[PDB]
RNA sequence: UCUUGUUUUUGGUUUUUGGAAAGCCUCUGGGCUAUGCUUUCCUCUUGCUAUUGCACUACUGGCAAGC
């Protein structure tokens, strides 16, 4: 599905996403899955409070993510 | 030595048996049947909420979603 | 192929038997908010066919009803099934 | 290394007593020995016990739980 | 279906877990699952005082996990 | 593309934006604005239109306009518009 | 073996939907998926807490979906058949 | 099935989510889960508004489905 | 030229620059048809055209932004909240206003923020800022510039 | 031939807001119910002034006050 080929072609870009959790995170993702986990570098968190940290690697589960976003010369990308 | 789920409601049934659900409720009652999901029914079943007898209703079904717990009275 | 097995002999055989018998059931729904009707047809996921449906459900307490004629009923919405005979 | 079912296996042989959380309830724990448990991750605890927060022991019986609503498995 | 998830890389290394109920772990990686089942050694809790209790091998369940960082790079 | 500096940089990036889209609508269709409120950008802007006839007009007609207080200084910018390039070849 | 088969059997009448958000849609329903996924024709929805609000080609992700209250005329006896 | 859903594809769509936020935008591609991706996106959270771009939700995450306006041509 | 349901299907549909959905209508003399749109545009561009009244608009909710620049508007319609209850900013830069009442209906758009009027004939008459700041409240920003405390005090004065 | 058992479609429920403690105001019914206000806990608007810089953006001056 393209869905989620989308998402394997923007590992290397700085994403931002929305959890169920409530916060936002962004930066650099490294890998990624047919599941939706993720794994990203220098993450800049803001949760609903607006509070900001840093965390150096974090793995997700994709059950847990509400949305995606992803850079815009990803628009162009093939879909099969 | 092990004692199994499906063993244990396969040897469960007929007996008193109280069981919870996630929102607090637990109802007592012997049991008739269980499915291969547990999905448990009960006869001549009193809700006891928060240790309070409610309303008597007899005949009953539970969806296996709810169930939090299984044991015995 | 064992689904056959489980609806003569296991917990929803009761809706069968009610449901054939012509009886009307008592359900708890996850809306908190009861329903008390006949059933016409239901399935292995407790999707079930409804008619002349009658609800009840407090607010801010005032307890408030409606008929409906006919309602298929997701059965992920049912929590609790009460399947009371007239008998 | 250790996969996780075979970890859990050692705690039927054992008889470890073992505190069980719950999903969306920090207010409620669980206590008691492993005798059986299955592919879903269902539970059959001995001797358990309700626990909370006020340390309200109360005591249960022989009991079942369902996979779902478990998150932490803890020894002793 | 049941891809076996990229954690090699965390084995036998310390952790910062996250889990639902806004509660938290620390512990060594063991061993993972296809569903994210987790076992970790050396279980630590993170209290909301922040008052830090040692309990020690653990298995968290896969559903609940929400992340898992690295406290050291 | 034109390059706007001289700009009031107490208007938030989002509404100044929308009113730089306004304001250059009336000479030719505005394909993109890009300004950044970083201590380097600050108080700039460029302005990219799809016509160039409509960036000279724009230019000469609102060569130091009071826009929020000050008055505008505008220019054409150095180099072509990612935009442009990729919208040409 | 289906109690979702008998909706697709239901396309084109007009019905009052509700769904776990708690919202209600009174609309011409155009195609039935084994999903439960409907798409409806000329709506008026309306969402909890706000007023009204009429749209063209709605449709919905079947996992929302409480229960469908449907017309009086339907004749359940027929549709119940393979 | 999946035959009226090929049948959106490139349309402005108004697509209501479970926590009641509302995006918009053309539909670029679609899945067997509803995973929807979206181009040039808005939020409205209530007089409010935001800028996204590429936005891909998920399926648990969609709730409804509403044409905004007919295919474009550009 | 006239605005007809099929010179809006073949107008060039797109997402600007300001992220929101923008209908390109760059010699119509009357609006009308906008039925048509299906209510899908954030942003309507009638920039260059010959339209003489600003009216005939069906219930447009979506529509937050209306580019009406070189044209020959000459008065306001009456009803125009009724069906553009949202209509946020609102730009008219060289047209024919020429009186200060011919501004009175943009009173009753509750959500206007943004207003531009220059280049118009009734830009020149004597308290034309004061007044529309008094009969149009709303306005936050006007001609480009911020609507000032001091500016609402001074308009209180004169037209109290 | 199957498609309700942890990552989507047969639900773990719900989102300035919610809950708790007394007082005041308004409405309805014959001292009850609902709402707001008042106390505690968990970027925006005023002034002022800094920066004149050729870009592709989580965000973007600093100081004081208000929320």
């Given at each position: 599905?393209?869905?989620?080929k989308?998402?394997?072609?923007?590992?290397?870009?700085?994403?931002?996403?929305?959890?169920?959790?409530?916060?936002?995170?962004?930066?650099?993702?490294?890998?990624?899955?047919?599941?939706?986990?993720?794994?990203?570098?220098?993450?800049?968190?803001?949760?609903?409070?607006?509070?900001?940290?840093?965390?150096?690697?974090?793995?997700?589960?994709?059950?847990?993510?509400?949305?995606?976003?992803?850079?815009?010369?990803?628009?162009?990308?093939?879909?099969? | 030595?092990?004692?199994?789920?499906?063993?244990?409601?396969?040897?469960?049934?007929?007996?008193?048996?109280?069981?919870?659900?996630?929102?607090?409720?637990?109802?007592?009652?012997?049991?008739?049947?269980?499915?291969?999901?547990?999905?448990?029914?009960?006869?001549?079943?009193?809700?006891?909420?928060?240790?309070?007898?409610t309303?008597?209703?007899?005949e009953?079904?539970?969806?296996?979603?709810?169930?939090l717990?299984?044991?015995?009275? | 192929?064992?689904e056959e097995?489980?609806?003569?002999a296991?917990?929803?055989?009761?809706?069968?038997?009610?449901?054939?018998?012509?009886?009307?059931?008592?359900?708890?729904c996850?809306?908190?908010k009861?329903?008390?009707?006949?059933?016409?047809?239901?399935?292995?996921?407790?999707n079930?066919?409804?008619?002349?449906?009658?609800?009840?459900?407090?607010?801010?307490?005032?307890?408030?009803?409606?008929?409906?004629?006919?309602?298929?009923?997701?059965?992920?919405?049912?929590v609790?099934?009460?399947?009371?005979?007239?008998? | 290394?250790?996969?996780?079912?075979?970890?859990?296996?050692?705690?039927?042989?054992?008889?470890?007593?073992?505190?069980?959380?719950?999903?969306?309830?920090?207010?409620?724990?669980?206590?008691?020995?492993?005798?059986?448990?299955?592919e879903?991750?269902?539970?059959?605890?001995?001797?358990?016990?309700?626990?909370?927060?006020?340390?309200?022991?109360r005591?249960?019986?022989?009991?079942?739980?369902?996979?779902?609503?478990?998150?932490?498995?803890?020894?002793? | 279906?049941?891809?076996?998830?990229?954690?090699?890389?965390?084995?036998?290394?310390?952790?910062?877990?996250?889990?639902?109920?806004?509660?938290?772990?620390?512990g060594?990686?063991?061993?993972?699952?296809?569903?994210?089942?987790?076992?970790?050694?050396?279980?630590?809790?993170?209290?909301?005082?922040?008052?830090?209790?040692?309990?020690?091998?653990?298995?968290?369940?896969?559903?609940?996990?929400?992340?898992?960082?690295?406290?050291?790079? | 593309?034109?390059?706007?500096?001289?700009?009031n940089?107490?208007?938030?990036?989002?509404?100044?934006?929308?009113?730089?889209?306004?304001?250059?609508?009336?000479?030719?269709?505005?394909?993109?604005?890009?300004?950044?409120?970083?201590?380097?950008?600050?108080?700039?802007?460029?302005?990219?239109?799809?016509?160039?006839?409509?960036?000279?007009?724009?230019?000469?007609?609102?060569?130091?306009?009071?826009?929020?207080g000050?008055?505008?200084?505008?220019?054409?910018?150095?180099?072509?518009?990612?935009?442009?390039?990729?919208?040409?070849? | 073996?289906?109690?979702?088969?008998?909706?697709?059997?239901?396309?084109?009448?007009?019905?009052?939907?509700?769904?776990?958000?708690?919202?209600?849609?009174?609309?011409?329903?155009?195609?039935?998926?084994?999903?439960?996924?409907?798409?409806?024709?000329?709506?008026?929805?309306?969402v909890?807490?706000?007023?009204?609000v009429?749209?063209?080609?709605?449709?919905?992700?079947?996992?929302?979906?409480?229960?469908?209250?449907?017309?009086?005329?339907?004749?359940?006896?027929?549709?119940?058949?393979? | 099935?999946?035959?009226?859903?090929?049948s959106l594809?490139?349309?402005?769509?108004?697509?209501?989510?479970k926590?009641?936020?509302?995006?918009?935008?053309?539909?670029?591609?679609?899945?067997?889960?509803?995973?929807?991706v979206?181009?040039?996106?808005?939020?409205?959270?209530?007089?409010?508004?935001?800028?996204?771009?590429?936005?891909?939700?998920?399926?648990?995450?969609?709730?409804?489905?509403?044409?905004?306006?007919?295919?474009?041509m550009? | 030229?006239?605005?007809?349901?099929?010179?809006?299907?073949?107008?060039?549909?797109?997402?600007?620059?300001?992220?929101?959905?923008?209908?390109?209508?760059?010699?119509?003399?009357?609006?009308?048809?906008l039925?048509?749109?299906?209510?899908?545009?954030?942003?309507?561009?009638?920039?260059?055209?010959?339209?003489?009244?600003?009216?005939?608009?069906?219930?447009?909710?979506?529509?937050?932004?209306?580019?009406?620049?070189?044209?020959?508007?000459?008065?306001?319609?009456?009803?125009?909240?009724?069906?553009?209850?949202?209509?946020?900013?609102?730009?008219?830069?060289q047209?024919?206003?020429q009186?200060?009442?011919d501004?009175?209906?943009?009173?009753?758009c509750?959500?206007?923020?943004?207003?531009?009027?220059?280049?118009?004939?009734?830009?020149?008459?004597?308290?034309?800022?004061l007044?529309?700041?008094?009969?149009?409240?709303?306005?936050?920003?006007?001609?480009?510039?911020?609507?000032?405390?001091?500016?609402?005090?001074?308009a209180?004065?004169?037209?109290?």
């Open positions: 599905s393209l869905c989620i989308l998402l394997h072609e923007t590992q290397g870009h700085i994403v931002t996403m929305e959890l169920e959790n409530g916060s936002t995170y962004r930066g650099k993702l490294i890998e990624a899955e047919d599941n939706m986990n993720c794994q990203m570098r220098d993450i800049s968190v803001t949760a609903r409070d607006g509070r900001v940290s840093h965390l150096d690697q974090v793995y997700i589960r994709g059950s847990h993510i509400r949305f995606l976003i992803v850079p815009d010369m990803l628009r162009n990308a093939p879909m099969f | 030595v092990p004692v199994n789920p499906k063993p244990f409601l396969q040897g469960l049934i007929g007996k008193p048996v109280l069981v919870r659900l996630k929102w607090g409720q637990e109802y007592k009652g012997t049991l008739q049947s269980v499915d291969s999901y547990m999905n448990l029914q009960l006869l001549n079943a009193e809700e006891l909420v928060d240790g309070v007898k309303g008597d209703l007899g009953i079904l539970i969806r296996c979603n709810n169930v717990w299984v044991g015995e009275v | 192929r064992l097995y489980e609806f003569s296991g917990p929803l055989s009761v809706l069968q038997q009610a449901v054939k018998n012509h009886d009307q059931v008592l359900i708890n996850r809306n908190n009861k329903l008390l009707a006949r059933v016409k047809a239901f399935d292995r996921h407790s079930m066919v409804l008619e002349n449906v009658k609800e009840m459900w407090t607010e801010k307490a005032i307890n408030k009803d409606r008929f409906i004629s006919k309602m298929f009923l997701r059965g992920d919405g049912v609790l099934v009460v399947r009371i005979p007239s008998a | 290394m250790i996969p996780p079912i075979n970890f859990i296996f050692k705690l039927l042989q054992q008889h470890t007593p073992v505190s069980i959380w719950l999903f969306e309830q920090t207010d409620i724990r669980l206590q008691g020995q492993i005798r059986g448990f299955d879903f991750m269902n539970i059959v605890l001995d001797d358990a016990v309700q626990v909370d927060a006020k340390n309200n022991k005591e249960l019986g022989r009991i079942l739980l369902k996979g779902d609503n478990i998150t932490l498995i803890q020894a002793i | 279906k049941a891809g076996a998830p990229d954690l090699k890389k965390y084995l036998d290394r310390q952790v910062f877990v996250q889990l639902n109920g806004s509660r938290k772990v620390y060594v990686l063991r061993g993972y699952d296809i569903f994210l089942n987790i076992v970790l050694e050396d279980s630590i809790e993170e209290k909301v005082d922040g008052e830090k209790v040692k309990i020690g091998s653990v298995a968290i369940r896969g559903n609940s996990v929400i992340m898992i960082e690295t406290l050291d790079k | 593309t034109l390059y706007v500096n001289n700009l940089d107490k208007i938030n990036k989002n509404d100044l934006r929308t009113a730089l889209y306004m304001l250059f609508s009336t000479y030719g269709t505005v394909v993109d604005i890009v300004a950044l409120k970083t201590p380097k950008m600050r108080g700039q802007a460029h302005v990219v239109f799809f016509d160039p006839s409509a960036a000279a007009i724009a230019m000469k007609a609102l060569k130091n306009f009071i826009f929020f000050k008055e505008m200084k505008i220019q054409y910018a150095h180099s072509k518009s990612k935009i442009i390039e990729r919208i040409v070849a | 073996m289906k109690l979702v088969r008998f909706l697709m059997k239901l396309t084109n009448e007009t019905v009052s939907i509700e769904l776990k958000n708690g919202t209600i849609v009174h609309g011409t329903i155009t195609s039935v998926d084994m999903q439960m996924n409907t798409h409806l024709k000329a709506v008026k929805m309306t909890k807490g706000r007023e009204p009429p749209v063209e080609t709605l449709s919905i992700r079947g996992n929302n979906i409480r229960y469908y209250i449907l017309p009086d005329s339907l004749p359940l006896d027929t549709l119940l058949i393979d | 099935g999946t035959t009226k859903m090929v594809l490139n349309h402005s769509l108004n697509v209501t989510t926590d009641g936020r509302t995006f918009v935008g053309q539909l670029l591609a679609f899945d067997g889960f509803m995973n929807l979206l181009s040039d996106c808005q939020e409205y959270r209530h007089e409010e508004k935001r800028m996204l771009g590429l936005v891909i939700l998920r399926g648990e995450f969609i709730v409804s489905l509403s044409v905004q306006g007919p295919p474009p550009d | 030229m006239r605005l007809n349901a099929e010179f809006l299907s073949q107008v060039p549909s797109f997402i600007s620059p300001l992220k929101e959905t923008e209908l390109d209508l760059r010699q119509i003399p009357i609006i009308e048809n039925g048509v749109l299906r209510d899908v545009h954030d942003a309507i561009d009638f920039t260059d055209n010959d339209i003489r009244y600003l009216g005939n608009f069906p219930r447009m909710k979506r529509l937050q932004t209306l580019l009406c620049g070189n044209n020959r508007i000459t008065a306001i319609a009456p009803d125009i909240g009724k069906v553009l209850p949202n209509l946020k900013t609102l730009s008219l830069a047209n024919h206003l009186e200060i009442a501004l009175d209906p943009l009173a009753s509750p959500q206007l923020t943004n207003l531009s009027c220059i280049d118009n004939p009734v830009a020149q008459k004597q308290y034309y800022r007044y529309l700041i008094w009969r149009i409240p709303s306005l936050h920003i006007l001609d480009f510039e911020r609507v000032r405390r001091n500016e609402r005090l001074r209180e004065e004169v037209f109290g």
